[PDB]
């Protein structure tokens, strides 16, 4: 069919309508006092959420242009989600404030490119000021505190994260599992981590999780492209005889090998999850050899000579439990001997000793780190399977918050960080009047999440915003008790990384959307 | 009746639509290359004009709100016309530029009262800078030059204005009428000028002129209110017996005395033109005695004892000619004896000598000035009555331009004055960002008339505006020859007073119109 | 009330639609083969004419804008009519061609003022080339020929105009009347002609004529304004007692004196025709004294002392016949003694001898010319009153054509004059591209009347236009015989003055209308 | 050649004297001449500056002088490195002229039914 084009300020007001709709629909849920939002269910009772991601995924508009605007702000919110794990409401509120003030200025004849440049300069200054104001969370006490706060005031979850954090170290790996006993369980077993995702989202057994959890699966290692599914035919026959889940690691999986795997998984006789080969080149081959050592498998390459057709059940690796994340994959309790793993550790350590390239040396160092450090597993201990699933979700998002805090730092939560940074950066000027206007847009836009939270509490937004701007340091307004004080004292804390990512992505999408004149679209039919 | 109210930005965009319509309709006529505008006459051929006043009076819009806007900008344009005599297109273009940029700013959430303050500060700075840049026109040569330029390159008209300027001095009275001979005739006869207007516009015999010209009229002098028309009944009977025009000076004329005079003038058996009593109190009585001395009349007052009923033909004053302007009235060749006028001059001169109050002394000084200086009369001399009427109009508006130049000064015309004083004041700042924005509105708005003139010439407005801004002094772009150079060299000159009045009135009306939200209106029926 | 404004190219295409409608409806009647046009008569049968003036007066459009255009082009057509007497179709065709090509160029982004300047330059060159190509018509034979051709091939009418032309000389007065006998009558009697029109068209007894013809009227002479009708009351009573038509000469007649005279004429008990006082000042007074000598009347002035109330039947002048044209008035066979007229001739001749001012001497010379030459009288002689009225109309418009030819000259008719001038001026260039375009507009526009005539003849317009452009001199295409040849040979001749006036007026109105953007109007209700 | 559209501006300045075999070919030459200035005007318009002012400034300068859009300052594109191949500009101008000349002389635009 044909297409429709609308360009100028009409497209800008269209996309502004769209972002206003989605931004309000997600910003109702912001904060601890955020109001509930009811979402569609096509069959049965509608669902009720306070989660910004859940409501954001559902929103799409009937008219094309506002739909475009909504989808842009939604995809930048989900990008901030995948980068950080939380704060998507904060990111969308910041996006709304910047986009609204930016196009309000653009309608006043102000130069959009200069506004984008001013916003970029102001948000760079805001990011460096956030890094200046960041408080380290490397100590175990603050780690336990933020784990408690994130997991709905549960000192058990944050505590368990703290001992696991000690177990696998500062940049180690912690994995959540359901435990049978009512006591919480912590174990340390050698595991594998690599940053590769699923080939198709249809491989996910649990759409509420977003990951592919397989128990005692056979693992195949490949360094070649899966050009045809006839290479996978003997493997599929063998795994159908075995009747167990199957994991595939290959260099490239073509669209039709993936299509046949999707056909097989909707048939579901075989349980096949395929991921790309992580790393690059010789590093990729070496770490695939490490994985084969960990699982007792064998790496298949066209250059060496073996083929995917010539695959036996012994040649495939095996492990006790694997989880394929959205862009990550973890392997727990591989069959491969710890002595061979230690020998591989020694080999790559001597590779570190002979390494002259700095980047290659860092690759070998992270290889020995993942090969020797292993993985801590926290098994949830309580009485009911219901509290298994909710406490498991609490451990998951609390661990995401904890690793976000460990990665960069932690600042006083509740939006007071942006208020304080805005107070510290009111002096920033631009190269002309327009860049100064864009700087003013950014500065008055960082105050938006606090105003939204206070508005959700029922208090006067501008009053509390002026009060917090009057205070200095970490003084702010506890929304839960609705009393003023130090966020550090009440424990209301947000990671530096999540706020930095939310602000950066909101500023990027708003500067991109300000300079949008032509909004072409499909014909509404 | 029942009425509709619209307040907010909707009323602002309504009035912006209206002012844009009127401003385009009048800005087509700006400049020497200004395009023709055709106006409907209800009967016969439609008129074609290049006059901004003529088209401006003609504009009324069909919807009520845009009509409100058009009426406001029209009345400020006519106020600038009555203040100066020309430049109403310049005033309306300035008004359009200020109002458009101001409401574009107010649409961006900018503070309207602060915009008013910033515009006020920038325009008073522009006025004082324009007074600094003014060139005196007190010498006779530049007076003749500006009289030539204003009267469509006629050195005869400007010359005659120059000898009249010599005849009655710096602030004297010059009156033009039609001479029989083919040579122009300059005479000096003792006369009167006082700043009082007609009671009704229906008294005007020539609506194209706007003044009541009467030949050999009887003049009545009164210091009392005309409460009833029975006081005017014997006077009306006497003037009907005489069959000559009649002029009335009274303290007050009531609405029903005016109504009966309107009835009589549309009957027109009597020719009655009535004015207020000029001056105030004892000063008014004294100068009315002076006028009675000038015309051989008698002042009628209730306090002394005589009444308007007890009026004879001898008691009324008389003169050879009178003219009653819109807010002025002059008397030429009164009957009253020059010896009695000289005695009155001596009496008020001794009053000056005994005067102790400064303002009263100035009143007596201007009294002796008008009583002794008299009136110069210029009689138009050529072959045809057609060139009588067009050359008379040329002498009239050239004389208005000349007295405007004499009053304050003359600056290089063609809009380069506003460009230069704009260049001189780019450094002016405000008490905050809002006033700085309003100052920027004023500065980029003073560049509008030059852009409109150049646009009418067919050249690129922004290029020529940048060229003029590049040049300094009086350098600019002659539109008539379409060549750059010095306006003083090409003689393109505008009075300081007309430009100052246009700028002040446009800034006042636009800042006033900015702070208008509630826009009540009658029901559209 | 409510008024609509349309400006830009939309108003231009509106007025183009209007001028196209009027121009088509009037160009149907161009030429000897011009097709007939029928017009509504509200009562009875509709009228049928080939007269461009008759149809052009009637044309007016239902929508306002095209009506405005039509009224403008009708105004310039009637201006060319009352300037010349014929050729209004030619003027309107020229106006259509110039306006159409001009707005077609304006729609192409061309500068309208430069196009107007180019048209002005090209039409000035065309006028001077026409004056170069003009053939004198001072000879009596060519005068008789053009009188024959103009009066539908009647050698009697042109012959009688020739003897009258000999009788009153080169610039004398010729008047047409009805004669009883079947032989045509010519008689020279001392008379008056002065260029003054009626106060109101309601004074005209014959709307088909446009003039006020009165037989044996009493003539009043006045040098004062008629402020009130009480001055005319004894005169009206005396002329009601006399029961004869009345003529009034006054300095000014006010709108209410005119209103009362209009009331009296629609009452029609009195037959009053009023005119302005011709001349100016002392010249006006002197020639009014001459008219009083011619008619035995008396001049009434306020300055001398006598009044219009003190008027007797003897004081008023009298004559055998008067005619009051649209802007002219002639008097035939005044009562006043020829000896007193000769004495006045001697007095103004001595005034010529003592005259030093050139213009005053020329005024006295034309005074003695009109006072001594008199008036030639051509009374139509034939059998029927029907042929009286048609032959009288033929003598009228033939005499207008004859005096037009005598005034400036005669050129070959049929539109070949404009073709030849266009051939002589194809080399004319402008100061830039746009002025050359406007010159091209004018040059290809003067070819329009010949193309329209040939199109009315049924021949191919462009073919005959190229054939005539190929020929040189006075070679052209006779439409009556539809054969080529020299226009002089079969006598197709047009006066230089009528063609020059038509072309000048068409160029002026097209230059005025090209630079027209704001076409304001009343509400369509 | 120095990029930023100054190539077309300069060659337009070099060829303003070119005439045609009649008035119409001179008009078409004027179309091409005023049309080669379009990319610079569009770039400057995107920068937020006045297009006609900067275009007149570049036409005032000669050689490789022009207006750097990245720094928004005047100067030599050879100095700032703003460059474009002669082949790409020549091909763009040739193809635009060919399609516009082909499209001017297009009267009959036949089509399918709008359904
Ligand atoms: N007690 C509190 N007082 C004040 N502010 C609080 C408090 N608890 C949380 N906040 C603030 O409210 C926000 C937390 O909102 P919420 O937990 O609903 O989701 P989010 O992190 O904003 O986003 P999402 O779940 O969509 O990724 C953060 O900005 C946090 O700093
Ligand atoms: N030759 C010229 N070159 C440049 N500018 C000129 C020239 N002649 C006049 N101007 C300018 O054009 C304007 C004159 O316009 P115009 O005489 O039509 O009426 P106006 O004074 O603008 O207003 P209005 O008649 O409505 O009171 C003034 O701003 C004057 O400075
Ligand atoms: N025999 C002829 N051959 C060619 N052209 C002719 C001939 N007779 C007249 N013409 C031309 O035709 C026109 C005469 O037209 P017509 O008598 O209908 O009125 P007009 O002069 O055009 O205008 P109007 O009557 O409206 O004032 C003139 O241009 C004249 O030169
Ligand atoms: N710094 C600069 N200053 C001025 N002009 C520049 C500058 N950088 C690039 N340009 C000009 O901008 C244009 C480059 O635009 P862009 O890279 O978006 O794509 P393009 O070459 O126009 O076309 P497309 O990508 O569609 O094939 C060229 O005309 C180039 O000369």
UniProtKB/Swiss-Prot annotation, chains A, B, C:
Question: Its catalytic activity?
Answer: ATP + H2O + a folded polypeptide = ADP + phosphate + an unfolded polypeptide
N6-acetyllysine PTM positions read 116
Name the PROSITE patterns on file: CHAPERONINS_CPN60
Q: A GO biological process this protein is involved in?
A: virion assembly
| N6-succinyllysine, modified sites | 33, 50, 116, 276, 320, 389
Matching InterPro entries: Chaperonin_Cpn60_CS, Cpn60/GroEL, Cpn60/GroEL/TCP-1, GroEL-like_apical_dom_sf, GROEL-like_equatorial_sf, TCP-1-like_intermed_sf
Q: How is it modified after translation?
A: Phosphorylated reversibly during heat shock.
Which Gene Ontology terms cover its molecular function? ATP binding; ATP hydrolysis activity; ATP-dependent protein folding chaperone; identical protein binding; isomerase activity; magnesium ion binding; unfolded protein binding
Q: Name one Pfam family in it.
A: Cpn60_TCP1
Does the entry annotate any disulfide bonds, and if so which pairs?
A: none
Oligomer status and interactors: Forms a cylinder of 14 subunits composed of two heptameric rings stacked back-to-back. Interacts with the co-chaperonin GroES. Can form asymmetrical complexes, composed of one GroEL and one GroES, and symmetrical complexes, formed between one GroEL and two GroES oligomers. The asymmetrical complex is the functional unit. It was suggested that the symmetric heterooligomer may represent a transient intermediate in the chaperonin protein folding cycle.
What this protein is reported to do is described as: Together with its co-chaperonin GroES, plays an essential role in assisting protein folding. The GroEL-GroES system forms a nano-cage that allows encapsulation of the non-native substrate proteins and provides a physical environment optimized to promote and accelerate protein folding, probably by preventing aggregation and by entropically destabilizing folding intermediates. Also plays a role in coupling between replication of the F plasmid and cell division of the cell.
The name this protein carries in UniProt is: Chaperonin GroEL
Q: In the record, what lineage is assigned to the organism producing the protein? A: Bacteria, Pseudomonadati, Pseudomonadota, Gammaproteobacteria, Enterobacterales
Q: Which gene encodes it?
A: groEL
